Amino acid sequence: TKETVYISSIALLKMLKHGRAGVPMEVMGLMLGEFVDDYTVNVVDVFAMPQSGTGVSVEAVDDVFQAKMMDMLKQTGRDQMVVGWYHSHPGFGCWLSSVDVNTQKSFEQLNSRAVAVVVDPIQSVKGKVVI
Amino acid sequence: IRIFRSELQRLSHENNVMLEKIKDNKEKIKNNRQLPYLVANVVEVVGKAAVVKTSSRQTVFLPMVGLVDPDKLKPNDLVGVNKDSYLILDTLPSEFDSRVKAMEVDEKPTETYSDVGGLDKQIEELVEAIVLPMKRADKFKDMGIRAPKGALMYGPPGTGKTLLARACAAQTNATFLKLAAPQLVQMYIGEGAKLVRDAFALAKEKAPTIIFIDELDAIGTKRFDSEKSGDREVQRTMLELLNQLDGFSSDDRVKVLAATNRVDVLDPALLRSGRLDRKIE
Amino acid sequence: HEKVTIAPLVLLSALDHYERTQTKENKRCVGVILGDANSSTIRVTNSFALPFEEDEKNSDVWFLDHNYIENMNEMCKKINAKEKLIGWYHSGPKLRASDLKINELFKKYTQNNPLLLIVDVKQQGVGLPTDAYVAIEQEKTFLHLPCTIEAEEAEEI
Amino acid sequence: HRRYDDQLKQRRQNIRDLEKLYDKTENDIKALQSIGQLIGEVMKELSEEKYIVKASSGPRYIVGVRNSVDRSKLKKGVRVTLDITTLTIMRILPRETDPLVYNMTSFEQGEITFDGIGGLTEQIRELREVIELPLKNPEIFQRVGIKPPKGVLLYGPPGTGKTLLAKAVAATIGANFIFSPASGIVDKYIGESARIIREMFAYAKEHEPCIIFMDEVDAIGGRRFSEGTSADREIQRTLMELLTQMDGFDNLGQTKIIMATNRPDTLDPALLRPGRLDRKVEIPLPNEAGRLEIFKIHTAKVKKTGEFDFEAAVKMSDGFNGADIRNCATEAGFFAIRDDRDHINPDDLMKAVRKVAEVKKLEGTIEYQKL
Amino acid sequence: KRIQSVPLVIGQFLEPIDQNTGIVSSTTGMSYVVRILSTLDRELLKPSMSVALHRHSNALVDILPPDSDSSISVMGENEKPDVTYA
């Protein structure tokens, strides 16, 4: 089925900038916001995760660096928890790989409402972002 | 005292736990290794990196793989590569390229020296060429001389000494390589040259080998007194015998016995103290 | 003279922090800019925020977080290694007399002349009210430079 | 007290062996995460961040770049690394065109030196004049005005030590040298024989002190215009390759061409004329004065008696060469084996010297190209 | 026009057939007949002009400028005037 996922105007500009790190190198970063029941995913703020040579794998996530940055974001006015993360798949369509399934499954015990977003900055040059 | 011995005792236990993870990773590697892979040509071996080229003429870059070492790797080498990830999972299987067209896999023939008679005059001369250096070469270095790199084999317009050529590959019980001269000329340019070029490449793997050439009159000429084109319809293969025998090959146990029909028509450049020493009628 | 270019990513980042930090009663939100000032055209490709609290009747009381300066080094440097601190920005329409003392705190981290960026959050002006100033030796004066909009695939899309 | 401690120290040898196997296994899993990466040369430039790189298979795809590479080295002609999926420029690699260890690296092992080529001293200074002189002091040719000789021709009958002239230089100077067999470059698929020659000169512009050796090549200098061509299509272009690199505007003078052949009449007369091969080095048969030092070269490492005379074999030699004396020294060893003699007697030498003069049938007097 | 973006194939124009339709020959050796993009024009190209194509569909993308890279000469003279005619 379908639902409505709201994304703030500031979050779209940051995801397109994060995907500019490189075309062959896939990028991944966290997000912030709230939810309304199960039918609404609100994307307010996004986080930029550091790069990893494993190509966005389950072992490429650092919880130590995550806990240190989210504690500093509380002083900046962010009261919202992590709503998910975005993963760029440049050059291809919108689909999930075998690595993304095992990676997203590891976060099911942490936050079951997490969202895995697939953004394609290469095909977004037409004026409408394919995501 | 017991504390120092307890840490070393638990060290072997922690190594066994991590060893099970290594054994599980090896099982994943064996599961990731399935017979249908492809073979590519190694281009170049800052960091550690290896460049290869597939047989389809596709150049793919790959990082250094733990399955291979820079000592074993070397440019211009055929190793197995992955079809999807294009990673080398297999090293060189102890063979440079291949036997190409044909190769002689026979071990020993049924012909010996007991089937001939009255030939002892010329038999002792053939023993001093391709036979004794297979054994007494250690004694040859003490005298300061060098083993002959070949001997011209000819005779009257007839059968010839080929009956004794089998006895040389029999009583000595060494490696024999049969190379036919008329089989070295083909319509494809360069394929006939790779036959002799790869003949000495595999001759370096097995040292006690003897290369035999039948009917040397098949390939040779100075190629003149004609009209324009038609050159190198012969000498393309002859240049292999010129460069290889005078090149890195023909060291100690690498020898070539060239049998032919008549000495009237041949290339005088083929006879040299660096290739064919003994010329025996 | 030199040139200053502010990307719309930095613009919307500074303008959104007004309601995010609950800024009211004519206050300011002090941020930070990230760009390359080595060339003749200053281009800011990244920006963040810093907590700022100042009394209305007391101009000698202001709060600034210097620990967050070291926190972005563990993040941005692992993504874009060319990002450095060229200065900071303010969300107030007009600068105050406290900006002279702010330059003393960031002069150690910045490797060049800090850039003073002013972004109007009221949007009551025409065109591009966002202005930039460069603090040099006069005692000290602020040299104004024209502000443009960054044109790149990471923004116009 | 030390009984249990010595047993734990002996087990440390197996522990250190397992520690070396842990890093090898962990690097295997990390290596499988990486995929293949295409390699291609930059063709042209459309935009700043948008370029065109020709794939190694022959199609041309428009590819992108990243922000982690320098745009100055991304210009045309530079070989870069592409991606098998996104098709973008990733890594910049130095220029290497078909590296071949057999056709480039000489695998140098010192064997023959100037002391073994002796007797050619009159003709040895001809090689050092076009090799040692221009490389050591190039300023001499500039003030005089003469141009440094590019190509060098080596002719004459075989067995005169012509092949040893190329090996004596590799064991002395030590610069980058290239072994180029004639029938090894004739490989034919589609236009292959013509592209191999251009692969050799790619290293000439990289390493300036380089010399291209040619060992017994009568092939690529052929003539063969039209009888119907007998499917020479790639060979005729290979003949023209020597008529381009040594002719056109490409930089020369830092790379010497040493060419060796048996009969120059078979080669294309246009290739022998000046402008390509500047110097023709005559390598005649060593005379009685030239051979006198050659007998001592082949017999230097050969054990013999105390009384020896090499002047006897000088008159016994009729139209021989420098190599045929090695045959005389080889046959002299087998003559002493039947008599159980470790040292070769002078009587066994004269028997082996004439043994070459008994065989004959080598011709050797039919070469009229001496000039 | 911007849907194509990075993954492009180098084509070559051959002959016009129909309005906003033309035959193209890429470097892969397989000639295809596709439709001309609306932002392009038949008068803005040449019979020998080289164009761009899609990776899979191989549809016409953009008209390259009249500069052919290929090999050999490429751009033009480099350090040629080293001598005179005398």
Residue D89 contacts residue D64 (beta carbons within 8 Å): yes
Domain extent, residue A40, equals 2-131
Cross-chain Cβ contact D93/B61 below 8 Å? yes
Chain B residues with CB inside 8 Å of D334's CB?
128, 145
3 state DSSP class of C138? coil
Which positions in chain A have a beta carbon within 8 angstroms of at least one beta carbon in chain E? 23, 91, 122-123, 125-127
Cross-chain Cβ contact D324/B61 below 8 Å? no
Partnered with residue D42 across adjacent β-strands are: D53
Q: Which of B66, B148, B273 sits opposite D28 (nearest CB)?
A: B66
Whole-number Å distance between alpha carbons of C8 and C97: 28
Partnered with residue D214 across adjacent β-strands are: D180
Whole-number Å distance between alpha carbons of A104 and A30: 12
| C156 residue type, one letter | E
Mutate to test the interface with D, among B37, B222, B227, B273 (most CBs of D within 10 A): B273
Residue C15 contacts residue C53 (beta carbons within 8 Å): no
| Placement of tokens 């291209």 in the chain | D212
- From first CA to last CA, the distance across chain C in angstroms is 30
Looking at the complex, report in whole angstroms how far the Cα of residue B203 sits from the nearest Cα belonging to chain D.
Answer: 16
Distant-in-sequence, close-in-space partners of B153: CB < 8 Å, separation ≥ 6: B160, B161, B165, B257, B258, B259, B260, B280
SS (H, E, C) chain D: CCHHHHHHHHCHHHHHHHHHHHHHHHHHHHHHCCCCEEEEEEEEECCCCEEEEECCCCCEEEEECCCCCCCCCCCCCCEEECCCCCCECCCECCCCCCCCCCCCCCCCCCCCCCCCCCCCHHHHHHHHHHCHHHHHCCHHHHHHCCCCCCEEEECCCCCCCHHHHHHHHHCCCCCEEEEECCCCCCCCCCCHHHHHHHHHCHHHHHCCCEEEEECCCCCCCCCCCCCCHHHCHHHHHHHHHHHHHCCCCCCCCCEEEEEECCCCCCCCHHHHCCCCEEEEECCCCCCHHHHHHHHHHHCCCCCECCCCCCHHHHHHCCCCCCCHHHHHHHHHHHHHHCCCCCCECHHHHHHHHHHHHHHCCCCCCCCCCCC
Give the experimental resolution in Å.
3.8
Q: Is D253 annotated as a binding residue?
A: no
Distant-in-sequence, close-in-space partners of D23: CB < 8 Å, separation ≥ 6: none
Whole-number Å distance between alpha carbons of B262 and D31: 62
Residue C116 contacts residue C133 (beta carbons within 8 Å): yes
Chain A residues with CB inside 8 Å of E6's CB?
23, 91, 122
Q: Is B109 annotated as a binding residue?
A: no
Q: Which of B18, B223, B224 sits opposite D22 (nearest CB)?
A: B18
3 state DSSP class of B88? strand
Chain D residues with CB inside 8 Å of A27's CB?
none
Tokens for B196, please give them.
């002799």
| Placement of tokens 């089998």 in the chain | B166
Tokens for D120, please give them.
């050619």
Cross-chain Cβ contact A72/C153 below 8 Å? no
Residue C91 contacts residue C23 (beta carbons within 8 Å): yes
3 state DSSP class of A123? helix
Backbone φ, ψ for residue B106 (5° rounding): -65, 140
Cross-chain Cβ contact B222/D84 below 8 Å? no
Q: At the fourth CATH level, which superfamily is domain C1-157?
A: Cytidine Deaminase, domain 2 (3.40.140.10)
Whole-number Å distance between alpha carbons of D77 and E71: 9
Q: Which of D64, D96, D91 is nearest to D80 (CA)?
A: D91
Chain D residues with CB inside 8 Å of B222's CB?
263, 266
Tokens for B109, please give them.
């023939």
Whole-number Å distance between alpha carbons of E9 and E3: 14
CA-derived radius of gyration, chain E: 17
Chain E residues with CB inside 8 Å of A23's CB?
6
Q: Which of D320, D294, D308 is nearest to D350 (CA)?
A: D308
3 state DSSP class of A82? strand
DSSP-H helix ranges across B157-261: 162-171, 191-203, 235-245
Cross-chain Cβ contact C13/A65 below 8 Å? no
Question: With touching defined as 3+ CB pairs under 8 A, do chains C and B touch?
Answer: no
Strands (E), B21-144: 38-44, 49-54, 58-63, 78-81
D210-214/D176-180 β-pairing: parallel
Whole-number Å distance between alpha carbons of D237 and D232: 9
Q: Which of B77, B11, B65 is nearest to D33 (CA)?
A: B65
3 state DSSP class of A76? helix
Whole-number Å distance between alpha carbons of D336 and D334: 5
DSSP-H helix ranges across chain A: 9-18, 63-73, 98-106
Tokens for D77, please give them.
């002609």
Tokens for B131, please give them.
């036979």
Cross-chain Cβ contact A13/C8 below 8 Å? yes
Whole-number Å distance between alpha carbons of D280 and B213: 36
Looking at the complex, report in whole angstroms how far the Cα of residue A91 sits from the nearest Cα belonging to chain E.
Answer: 8
- From first CA to last CA, the distance across chain D in angstroms is 92
Whole-number Å distance between alpha carbons of D21 and D35: 24
Q: Which of C8, C78, C157 sits opposite A125 (nearest CB)?
A: C157
For residue B83, the surrounding DSSP H or E stretch is: none
Q: Is B157 annotated as a binding residue?
A: yes
Strands (E), chain C: 3-6, 31-36, 41-49, 84-90, 115-118, 131-137, 140-145, 147-149
The total of structural domains in chain A comes to 1
| D91 residue type, one letter | R
Nearest residue in B to D22, CA atom: B22
Cross-chain Cβ contact E9/D58 below 8 Å? no
Residue D161 contacts residue D283 (beta carbons within 8 Å): yes
Phi-psi region of D340 (alpha: psi -120 to 50; beta: other; left: phi over 0): left
Cross-chain Cβ contact A124/C80 below 8 Å? no
Alpha carbon of residue A28 to chain centroid = 6
| D44 residue type, one letter | K
Residues in chain C: 157
Strands (E), C28-114: 31-36, 41-49, 84-90
Whole-number Å distance between alpha carbons of D287 and B129: 30
Mutate to test the interface with A, among C80, C82, C152 (most CBs of A within 10 A): C80
Domain residue ranges of chain C, discontinuous segments joined by +:
1-157
Whole-number Å distance between alpha carbons of D236 and D219: 11
Whole-number Å distance between alpha carbons of D75 and D16: 49
Which positions in chain E have a beta carbon within 8 angstroms of at least one beta carbon in chain D? 6-10, 26-28, 52, 55, 64, 67, 69, 74-75, 80
Cross-chain Cβ contact A54/D64 below 8 Å? no
For residue C128, the surrounding DSSP H or E stretch is: none
Whole-number Å distance between alpha carbons of D161 and E65: 59
Whole-number Å distance between alpha carbons of D105 and D177: 7
Cross-chain Cβ contact B222/D266 below 8 Å? yes
